């Protein structure tokens with residue numbers, strides 16, 4: 001079945017977040033092929049357990065601990081996939097479904113071993129970066145970003161102050177303006193994501209674009 | 215936790231059977247670090263589900279379906295171990311505990327792939343044969359044995375009829391006499407096991423030693 005229920009919901013919410021979708025209960029229900037009311041029952045208990053808040057707008061907001069797990073689940077999932085693909089040679093059409101069971105039972109140590117053995121752990125076979133490899137072994141953007149991805153709102157871009165200007169069009173093409181509710185992250189390497197499009201910001205631009213919490 | 219409860223109990227019972235131990239509820243309880251009464255509750259439901267009978271003598275007797283699963287669980291477990299060891303390079307001290315989670319979520323297809331990729335699937339890293347590789351892709355012994363291992367009783371040995379005699383001592387050393395409750399199997403290659411010692415019987419001896427059900 002789902003193997004680990006809470007972890008299913010956690011990885012679901014991450015993945016909605018990566019696609020730029022608002023992690024709504026109905027969205028999660030749909031993705032998991034579960035019922036809405038079954039979904040609220042689980043969300044209730046994830047709340048209790050400290051993994052989630054149900055925000056004003058009804059969006060599931062992962063607590064930092066919640067987001068840490070979700071990231072860990074996701075990293076296991078993606079590495080099981082690389083493992084299944086690169087090494088085992090499992091039919092690509094079953095790799096995901098399999099990794100959907102293995103994500104819940106892979107130890108940290110096995111993950112660490114997989115980093116050693118595989119050729120490249122930058123992305124899953126399905127083209128998505130693998131997160132949390134570090135964990136394993138108004139307000140300026142440069143200052144509002146952390147290690148973990150938050151949706152925030154663009155409050156000003158300040159193109160007047162910029163020497164380097166080729167990213168003006170990259171933002172525009174990403175419909176990043178005004179704004180304009182985008183996910184920001186970190187590493188300095190800040191990324192603005194908008195639905196679900198990435199603009200890797202050069203430092204001058206990150207230092208000058210300002211955000212506000214939603 | 216146990217990941218899959220029924221499958222835990224099934225593989226436990228197999229493994230008691232392989233060591234020549236009588237699969238008693240208290241034995242299973244002890245192995246799983248569960249309580250006796252928790253063990254009867256599970257056994258009740260495995261009965262319902264058709265996987266087990268509780269025999270006169272209070273021994274758990276796997277139904278053929280039960281024994282088929284148990285074999286499949288065991289084969290997954292052992293191949294996860296080979297996989298963990300040979301390929302992943304997981305610390306040998308954690309290989310078992312890990313395979314204890316992976317045994318419940320490995321597909322048949324993944325198993326089949328593992329047969330291709332690994333060098334030798336004859337035994338687990340812990341020295342136990344891997345069973346069911348075929349499934350995946352009074353009464354004479356030759357006639358009482360099937361593909362799946364039954365404990366039966368030795369009713370006569372008939373050493374008077376034997377040309378080849380070097381196995382006389384092999385039986386004796388295995389305390390196989392009179393007898394004498396032993397597991398028998400198949401392939402012709404019949405094996406008599408006694409606690410938990412194997413005598414691979416040559417054909418003349420298998421054709422002439424007679425058994426009775428317990």
Ligand code: NI
Pocket residue numbers: 077081096099126
């Ligand atoms: Ni996947």
Ligand code: NI
Pocket residue numbers: 002003004008099100101103104
């Ligand atoms: Ni899953």
Ligand code: NI
Pocket residue numbers: 291295310313340
């Ligand atoms: Ni083991």
Ligand code: NI
Pocket residue numbers: 216217218222313314315317318
């Ligand atoms: Ni297990």
